[PDB]
Amino acid sequence: RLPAHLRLQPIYWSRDDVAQWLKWAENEFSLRPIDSNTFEMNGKALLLLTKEDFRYRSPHSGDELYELLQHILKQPAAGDELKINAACRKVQHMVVKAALLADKFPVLHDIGNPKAIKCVPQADVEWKFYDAQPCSDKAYKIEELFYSYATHSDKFTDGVCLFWNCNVDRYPANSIVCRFKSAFVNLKQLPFFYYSDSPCESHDYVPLKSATCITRCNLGGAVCRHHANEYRLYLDAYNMMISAGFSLWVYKQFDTYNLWNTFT
Ligand SMILES: CCN(C[C@H]1O[C@@H](n2cc(C#Cc3cccnc3)c3c(N)ncnc32)[C@H](O)[C@@H]1O)S(=O)(=O)c1ccc(OC)c(C#N)c1
Ligand SMILES: [Zn+2]
């Protein structure tokens, strides 16, 4: 049992998440009321305290809270499927949009897409679809193809390849990948970043200091309120996807400085 605002692993919890954890546990287990600032820290810090630190901070429920956390760690909550679908779509659009802008691939080979739907429909690129089992109502614009590196490593060399949850034996070097370690040898892990080219708007909040917020307003280090809100929503989606066991990989020459250069 857990609120839908706590289903992520405690490592990703914010300081506000911890306070909600305390209030939820206060009601679920009929514990003595506890001040929210008793555990004024985020999740990664809360996981470093000892059971004794819990007892000192909360004499009346410290031991109980500690054991509750250990069960949450031993049996993690399952995320909502629709929420995870939305998160995955947001990440897919962000990453593929950025790669196309950064490196201006003339062609995208979407391998494992059975519905012929572009995740970045506005991009200036030739979009091609392949799938081993295309949907009957979209097969007329999908190449029926089971990708295997040993068979196709000399194909799809122009442009970039997208494998979104298409768990092939081994990815080509020019690929963008989401997968739920030998398969990735031609690639590198994709570090987190947020990119936006939408216009800034002034009406901040808690000021956002982050080198990974790639926005025009961040060139000067002062992120506008709109992009700060977008960044935080995107990070929540990214974390939800990472917590659910997905990992992102990319062609080795992917470079975020190419994204910064789009603002000049
Ligand atoms: C649209 C995404 N899907 C996958 C799509 O890729 C097609 N496909 C699969 C492939 C495979 C494989 C393989 C190779 C070695 C060993 N064993 C399996 C292959 C392929 N070689 N070439 C083209 N096309 C493919 C498939 O027809 C489908 O359309 S999925 O199945 O909905 C899905 C969703 C979420 C997931 O995880 C959260 C997972 C997982 N895991 C899968
Ligand atoms: Zn902005």
Author numbering: 222 to 401, 433 to 455, 464 to 524
What text does the study give?
Nsp14 is an RNA methyltransferase (MTase) encoded by all coronaviruses. In coronaviruses, that is the nsp16 MTase that methylates the 2′-O-ribose position of the first nucleotide and nsp14 MTase that methylates the N7 position of the guanosine of the precap structure. Coronaviral nsp14, similarly to most MTases, uses S-adenosyl methionine (SAM) as the donor of the methyl group. In fact, many viral families, including DNA viruses, encode MTases that catalyze the methylation of the RNA precap structure, resulting in fully capped viral RNA. This capping is crucial for efficient viral RNA translation, stability, and immune evasion.
We used the nsp14 MTase domain fused to a small crystallization tag TELSAM. The obtained crystals belonged to the hexagonal P65 space group and diffracted to 2.0 Å resolution. The 7-deaza-adenine moiety of STM957 forms two hydrogen bonds with Tyr368 and one with Ala353, while the ethynyl linker bound to C7 forms hydrophobic interactions with Phe367. The central ribose part of the ligand forms two hydrogen bonds with Asp352 via its hydroxyl moieties. The N-ethyl substituent of sulfonamide group forms a hydrophobic interaction to Pro335, while the SO2 group is surface-exposed. The cyano substituent of the benzenesulfonamide part is hydrogen-bound to Asn388 and the methoxy group forms a hydrophobic interaction with Phe506. However, the benzenesulfonamide moiety occupies and a different position than the methionine moiety. Interestingly, these water molecules are removed by the large 7-deaza substituent.
